[PDB]
Each structure stands twice: as structure tokens, then as C-alpha cells.
Design a protein around this motif. Structure first.
Motif, PDB file in Angstrom:
ATOM      1  N   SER A  81       0.789  -1.222   0.000  1.00  0.00           N
ATOM      2  CA  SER A  81       0.000   0.000   0.000  1.00  0.00           C
ATOM      3  C   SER A  81       0.825   1.278   0.000  1.00  0.00           C
ATOM      4  O   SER A  81       0.272   2.341  -0.284  1.00  0.00           O
ATOM      5  CB  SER A  81      -0.957   0.028   1.201  1.00  0.00           C
ATOM      6  OG  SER A  81      -0.261  -0.043   2.405  1.00  0.00           O
ATOM      7  N   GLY A  82       2.143   1.194   0.116  1.00  0.00           N
ATOM      8  CA  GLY A  82       3.023   2.365  -0.050  1.00  0.00           C
ATOM      9  C   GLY A  82       3.092   3.311   1.127  1.00  0.00           C
ATOM     10  O   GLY A  82       3.579   4.424   0.906  1.00  0.00           O
TER      11      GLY A  82
ATOM     12  N   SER B 144      10.579   4.727   5.527  1.00  0.00           N
ATOM     13  CA  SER B 144      11.093   3.683   6.416  1.00  0.00           C
ATOM     14  C   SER B 144      11.364   2.347   5.707  1.00  0.00           C
ATOM     15  O   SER B 144      12.267   1.627   6.109  1.00  0.00           O
ATOM     16  CB  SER B 144      10.115   3.438   7.591  1.00  0.00           C
ATOM     17  OG  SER B 144       9.876   4.609   8.351  1.00  0.00           O
ATOM     18  N   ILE B 145      10.627   1.990   4.667  1.00  0.00           N
ATOM     19  CA  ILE B 145      10.813   0.690   4.019  1.00  0.00           C
ATOM     20  C   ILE B 145      10.398   0.789   2.554  1.00  0.00           C
ATOM     21  O   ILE B 145       9.401   1.443   2.243  1.00  0.00           O
ATOM     22  CB  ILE B 145       9.974  -0.375   4.737  1.00  0.00           C
ATOM     23  CG1 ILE B 145      10.408  -1.769   4.284  1.00  0.00           C
ATOM     24  CG2 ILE B 145       8.488  -0.071   4.518  1.00  0.00           C
ATOM     25  CD1 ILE B 145       9.503  -2.881   4.746  1.00  0.00           C
TER      26      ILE B 145
ATOM     27  N   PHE C  75      15.083  -1.682   4.745  1.00  0.00           N
ATOM     28  CA  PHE C  75      14.744  -0.684   5.746  1.00  0.00           C
ATOM     29  C   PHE C  75      15.678   0.503   5.589  1.00  0.00           C
ATOM     30  O   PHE C  75      16.827   0.367   5.158  1.00  0.00           O
ATOM     31  CB  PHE C  75      14.816  -1.251   7.187  1.00  0.00           C
ATOM     32  CG  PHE C  75      13.787  -2.320   7.453  1.00  0.00           C
ATOM     33  CD1 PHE C  75      12.520  -1.988   7.860  1.00  0.00           C
ATOM     34  CD2 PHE C  75      14.081  -3.639   7.250  1.00  0.00           C
ATOM     35  CE1 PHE C  75      11.566  -2.942   8.071  1.00  0.00           C
ATOM     36  CE2 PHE C  75      13.129  -4.596   7.464  1.00  0.00           C
ATOM     37  CZ  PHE C  75      11.869  -4.253   7.884  1.00  0.00           C
ATOM     38  N   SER C  76      15.135   1.676   5.890  1.00  0.00           N
ATOM     39  CA  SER C  76      15.906   2.903   5.999  1.00  0.00           C
ATOM     40  C   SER C  76      16.788   2.897   7.245  1.00  0.00           C
ATOM     41  O   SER C  76      16.329   2.578   8.347  1.00  0.00           O
ATOM     42  CB  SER C  76      14.955   4.095   6.089  1.00  0.00           C
ATOM     43  OG  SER C  76      15.582   5.157   6.781  1.00  0.00           O
TER      44      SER C  76
ATOM     45  N   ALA D  65      10.623   4.354  13.379  1.00  0.00           N
ATOM     46  CA  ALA D  65       9.203   4.713  13.357  1.00  0.00           C
ATOM     47  C   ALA D  65       8.371   3.505  12.970  1.00  0.00           C
ATOM     48  O   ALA D  65       7.262   3.277  13.502  1.00  0.00           O
ATOM     49  CB  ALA D  65       8.985   5.860  12.385  1.00  0.00           C
ATOM     50  N   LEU D  66       8.916   2.685  12.098  1.00  0.00           N
ATOM     51  CA  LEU D  66       8.174   1.512  11.649  1.00  0.00           C
ATOM     52  C   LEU D  66       8.182   0.427  12.741  1.00  0.00           C
ATOM     53  O   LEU D  66       7.127  -0.154  13.054  1.00  0.00           O
ATOM     54  CB  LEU D  66       8.765   1.046  10.316  1.00  0.00           C
ATOM     55  CG  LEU D  66       8.074  -0.131   9.608  1.00  0.00           C
ATOM     56  CD1 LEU D  66       8.510  -0.214   8.125  1.00  0.00           C
ATOM     57  CD2 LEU D  66       8.370  -1.415  10.353  1.00  0.00           C
ATOM     58  N   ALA D  67       9.353   0.171  13.348  1.00  0.00           N
ATOM     59  CA  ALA D  67       9.402  -0.708  14.511  1.00  0.00           C
ATOM     60  C   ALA D  67       8.379  -0.288  15.560  1.00  0.00           C
ATOM     61  O   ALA D  67       7.590  -1.100  16.070  1.00  0.00           O
ATOM     62  CB  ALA D  67      10.807  -0.712  15.126  1.00  0.00           C
TER      63      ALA D  67
END
Length: 91
Positions: free
Chosen positions: A14-15, A20-21, A33-34, A40-42
DNA sequence: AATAAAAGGAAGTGGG
DNA sequence: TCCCACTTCCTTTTAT
């Protein structure tokens, strides 16, 4: 609940969290991963699971590494890069 | 160097 | 009960 690989795949398809990824090769399932924005994604993963503690990238990768035994997600020999199985990319 | 990443054992947690 | 799918915690190794 929702599995980690599924959470990751849904963000990719879904973008959301493109900072972050992102895909490295979409047709091969390989993603990355960035360095700067992975936390932020974790954090979002841990909020969504209701975990007691703040989820970090290191703890998430610890889970990710367990998929190496089953096969859903394979580590690539590139910094912060992983790869979904073909089985995972169907359903 | 230096340092972020990768690794993984082991006991802990939810929920089904 | 048990097992799943992580989660937590920490030290050591590897890659950049």
C-alpha cells in the motif's frame, strides 16, 4: 493477531512508510529498511501488537531472523535488506 | 580505528 | 495444560 511478515508486506503493497521501508526488487520480493527511519516503523509494529515495551528495530529483526527457519522471509547479504518467499507473495 | 548491524540463546508473554 | 509467534534481554561477532 497479525503476523510480522504480513504487516510488512501490507505496508509495502500500500506504499505507507516509504521513508522507512521500500522495495529493492518488487518482482523478486526484496525490500530494505531505511537506516534513519526504521525505528518509526518498529514502533508502529509494537503499538499495533499491544506490546508492553517500545518495539525497536533490533527486536523486530530478532523476530525477522526466526522466519529464516520456516522460510517466509530470508535475509539478504545487503545492509537492512530482506526477501519474502514466493509463497508469501501469493496470498 | 569506530560503530551500526547481525547474530542467537534463553527465558517471558499473549492468546488460541 | 500446551504451542505459536513473537518479545525481551544481553553479549559477542561481523560488516561497513
Amino acid at each position: 493477531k497479525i503476523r510480522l511478515y504480513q504487516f510488512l508486506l501490507d505496508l509495502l503493497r500500500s506504499g505507507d512508510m516509504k521513508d522507512s521501508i521500500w522495495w529493492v526488487d518488487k518482482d523478486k520480493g526484496t525490500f530494505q529498511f531505511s537506516s534513519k527511519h526504521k525505528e518509526a516503523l518498529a514502533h508502529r509494529w509494537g503499538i499495533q501488537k499491544g506490546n508492553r515495551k517500545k518495539m525497536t528495530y533490533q527486536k523486530m529483526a530478532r523476530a525477522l531472523r526466526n522466519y529464516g527457519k520456516t522460510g517466509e522471509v530470508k535475509k539478504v547479504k545487503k545492509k537492512l535488506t530482506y526477501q519474502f518467499s514466493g509463497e508469501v507473495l501469493g496470498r
